[PDB]
Amino acid sequence: ATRFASVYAWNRKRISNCVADYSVLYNSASFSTFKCYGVSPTKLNDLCF
């Protein structure tokens, strides 16, 4: 996204009805911080949400 919202007006979007390869986003080597709670990002995209 080109423009990001302010923190007090944090933007929310809802995503459903699609297929996502979370490993790609994980294996992007582009993020400073990447922490998952309740789940381990390393190839646990094998579940339905």
Added chain:
Amino acid sequence: LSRLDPPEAEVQIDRLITGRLQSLQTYVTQQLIRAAEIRASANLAATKM
């Protein structure tokens, strides 16, 4: 098992193991006491016979 890596699955499974083991010990002790009472009654019945 399907949502976490082993390092934290260890903690979670430890909690579950602790709880279930304590439940089993409670159940077994109750059964031992009840069996003692039943044996006393059975001895009385044999004596009456």
